[PDB]
Amino acid sequence: SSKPFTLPILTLGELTNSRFPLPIDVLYTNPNESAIVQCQNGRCTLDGELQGTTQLLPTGICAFRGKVTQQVQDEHRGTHWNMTVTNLNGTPFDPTEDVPAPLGTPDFSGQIYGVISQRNTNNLPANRAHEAVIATYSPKFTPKLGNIQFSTWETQDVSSGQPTKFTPVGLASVDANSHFDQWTLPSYSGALTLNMNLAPSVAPVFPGECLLFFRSFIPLKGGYGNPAIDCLMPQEWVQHLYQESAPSLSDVALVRYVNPETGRTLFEAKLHRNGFLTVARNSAGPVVAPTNGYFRFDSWVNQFYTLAPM
Amino acid sequence: SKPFTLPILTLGELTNSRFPLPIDVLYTNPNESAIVQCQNGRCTLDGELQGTTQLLPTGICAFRGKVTQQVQDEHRGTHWNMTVTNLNGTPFDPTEDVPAPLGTPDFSGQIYGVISQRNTNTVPGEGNLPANRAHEAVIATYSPKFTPKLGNIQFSTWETQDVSSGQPTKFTPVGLASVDANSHFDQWTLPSYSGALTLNMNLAPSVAPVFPGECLLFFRSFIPLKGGYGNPAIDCLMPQEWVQHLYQESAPSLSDVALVRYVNPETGRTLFEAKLHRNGFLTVARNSAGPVVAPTNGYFRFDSWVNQFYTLAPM
Numbered sequence: 001s002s003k004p005f006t007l008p009i010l011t012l013g014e015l016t017n018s019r020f021p022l023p024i025d026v027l028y029t030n031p032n033e034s035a036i037v038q039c040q041n042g043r044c045t046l047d048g049e050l051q052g053t054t055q056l057l058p059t060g061i062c063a064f065r066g067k068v069t070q071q072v073q074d075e076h077r078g079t080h081w082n083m084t085v086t087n088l089n090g091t092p093f094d095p096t097e098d099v100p101a102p103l104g105t106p107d108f109s110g111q112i113y114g115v116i117s118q119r120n121t122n123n124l125p126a127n128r129a130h131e132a133v134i135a136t137y138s139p140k141f142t143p144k145l146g147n148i149q150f151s152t153w154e155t156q157d158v159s160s161g162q163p164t165k166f167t168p169v170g171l172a173s174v175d176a177n178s179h180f181d182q183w184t185l186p187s188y189s190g191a192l193t194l195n196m197n198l199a200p201s202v203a204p205v206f207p208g209e210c211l212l213f214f215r216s217f218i219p220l221k222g223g224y225g226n227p228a229i230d231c232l233m234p235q236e237w238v239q240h241l242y243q244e245s246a247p248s249l250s251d252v253a254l255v256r257y258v259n260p261e262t263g264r265t266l267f268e269a270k271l272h273r274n275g276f277l278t279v280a281r282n283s284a285g286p287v288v289a290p291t292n293g294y295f296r297f298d299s300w301v302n303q304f305y306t307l308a309p310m
Numbered sequence: 311s312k313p314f315t316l317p318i319l320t321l322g323e324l325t326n327s328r329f330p331l332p333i334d335v336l337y338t339n340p341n342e343s344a345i346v347q348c349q350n351g352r353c354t355l356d357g358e359l360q361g362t363t364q365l366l367p368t369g370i371c372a373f374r375g376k377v378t379q380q381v382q383d384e385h386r387g388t389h390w391n392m393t394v395t396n397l398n399g400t401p402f403d404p405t406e407d408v409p410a411p412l413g414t415p416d417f418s419g420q421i422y423g424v425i426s427q428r429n430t431n432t433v434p435g436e437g438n439l440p441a442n443r444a445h446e447a448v449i450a451t452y453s454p455k456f457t458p459k460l461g462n463i464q465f466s467t468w469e470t471q472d473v474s475s476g477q478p479t480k481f482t483p484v485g486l487a488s489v490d491a492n493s494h495f496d497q498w499t500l501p502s503y504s505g506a507l508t509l510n511m512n513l514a515p516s517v518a519p520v521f522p523g524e525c526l527l528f529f530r531s532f533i534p535l536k537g538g539y540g541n542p543a544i545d546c547l548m549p550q551e552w553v554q555h556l557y558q559e560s561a562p563s564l565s566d567v568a569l570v571r572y573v574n575p576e577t578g579r580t581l582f583e584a585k586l587h588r589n590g591f592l593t594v595a596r597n598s599a600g601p602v603v604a605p606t607n608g609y610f611r612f613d614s615w616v617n618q619f620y621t622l623a624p625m
């Protein structure tokens with residue numbers, strides 16, 4: 001009688017990343033990854049429980065809302081601005097809630113590039129927008145405490161006490177001094193303080209298995225690089241699972257990547273209860289798969305199930 | 311027949327299908343004089359995408375292509391021509407029965423965003439990696455150089471030189487550059503997709519109330535501005551999550567009009583009712599313009615199929 005588990009019917013070209021507002025470009029593996037994988041956006045259990053900083057809006061991923069309170073010039077170039085942040089729905093962020101940070105807060109170390117825009121509260125309001133960068137590794141990045149900093153090239157035209165939106169676009173840099181690491185969590189309350197209420201880390205537990213990611217290439221403001229952001233599940237999956245809230249019948253679901261044309265299965269994967277995929281693959285890099293393919297739920301299995309090798 | 315359904319999403323869990331914005335408020339404007347015929351956020355109740363509608367929230371008002379060259383334009387700023395492909399990177403075939411590449415903007419205005427590039431060619435000394443650049447950009451969709459159905463559009467930058475010819479280019483929309491009279495913002499005026507003096511084709515049809523006392527109901531989002539005075543909004547017929555849901559489900563439509571109730575989960579009560587029409591739009595019995603003041607925690611629930619003779623309870 002339990003509601004059957006399902007995934008949406010969506011090709012890679014119909015999916016978007018749950019960790020940054022980007023389309024999914026390729027499926028991807030990296031077996032030799034030395035880092036602990038514990039991202040906080042795109043986290044949802046198979047029975048529909050959102051975790052980490054995950055919320056449902058594609059427009060909310062790596063977004064901030066708040067007001068500017070302080071202008072501090074950089075030593076050499078640019079200007080820093082303190083921003084008090086609210087929840088994305090505009091209500092005050094309550095730091096006593098059991099979340100790591102306001103929902104949508106970025107979940108990686110780096111310099112995030114985007115646009116800060118403002119519409120004044122006070123017969124038509126005045127507006128302004130400028131390019132902006134948020135350094136999530138900065139000691140001033142303390143979203144769990146209700147405050148962050150962003151920097152601009154613009155030196156003066158940011159207003160205080162006025163509603164402010166950050167729309168993310170890409171990364172500002174991937175140079176050594178910009179500290180881009182997609183698997184390093186920001187310190188949500190500042191450097192000396194432990195992050196709290198985190199979605200759990202994910203890993204394969206069967207020899208020969210590795211994580212399977214939905215990879216998107218992220219725009220760069222300048223420099224050399226081909227940076228990517230890998231998510232455990234696309235945003236449409238998070239949205240689907242939340243809607244469905246189907247009971248999980250074991251800790252591991254078997255899914256098949258199918259070509260609808262031929263009806264052929266290209267490979268199978270384990271979809272784990274906590275909301276991530278593993279496959280039996282001994283290499284790194286993109287999965288080369290037809291454009292019409294998608295994952296279909298097959299059955300519930302267990303941690304001891306042996307995946308057909310890719 | 312598979313039962314028709316809507317997703318269970320509060321207003322605060324929905325996004326606009328015509329620009330990448332959250333839904334802020336439900337909205338009516340009974341005395342609107344324009345024909346309402348937007349092309350994004352168009353989907354029948356049985357799951358048929360229409361106009362330039364596609365499924366990705368990242369694809370709405372996005373472009374992908376390659377800059378060809380810097381071009382002269384009499385208007386202020388530095389101007390660049392870019393060819394445009396489909397969003398998936400394949401060549402746009404002007405013989406397909408669509409008005410323009412899916413995701414193309416469906417309104418007249420100066421769309422503000424960011425152009426970014428990642429070069430095709432890589433440098434061995436740079437670890438075999440490509441050079442990149444990004445800058446703010448504006449696309450005037452009313453320009454005679456806005457010809458997405460012909461595979462080319464033009465954008466302007468404040469930046470004067472640092473845009474590279476022949477390199478992969480992405481436009482990420484952010485808001486509008488201006489809503490002054492001279493910036494020709496009109497959310498119900500379609501661009502001329504093939505340029506000045508040409509007829510648009512393959513359009514999703516116009517929408518309108520039929521029953522006396524009814525008006526369209528919109529999902530409204532406020533859109534950021536680069537500068538100037540204004541509080542511009544973009545109104546969609548259905549949010550992007552509804553397009554995505556109807557597409558997935560493709561439930562047969564059992565009449566031309568479905569009855570839906572806007573419900574408060576906490577109270578459990580119906581705040582108002584609306585008609586959800588087969589072509590994918592809502593009407594209500596309301597004789598005022600402005601926001602519908604209700605909890606963002608409320609949502610639409612499918613009640614039953616009705617017909618063109620059914621009278622809505624007044625809001």
Ligand SMILES: CC(=O)N[C@@H]1[C@@H](O[C@@H]2O[C@@H](C)[C@@H](O)[C@@H](O)[C@@H]2O)[C@H](O[C@@H]2O[C@H](CO)[C@H](O)[C@H](O)[C@H]2O[C@@H]2O[C@@H](C)[C@@H](O)[C@@H](O)[C@@H]2O)[C@@H](CO)O[C@H]1O
Nearest residue numbers: 111133172173174175178221222223224441442443444472
């Ligand atoms: C500092 C930062 O946040 N990112 C920098 C890049 O500098 C930023 O992006 C540039 C495109 C400019 O807008 C710059 O003002 C901005 O701070 C930096 O790019 C170079 O920046 C210098 C000036 O500092 C020049 O503008 C230079 O042209 C930029 O080079 C870019 O990348 C090249 C590889 C080429 O693709 C050029 O066409 C680009 O303009 C990069 C490289 O030093 O480093 C980031 O950290």
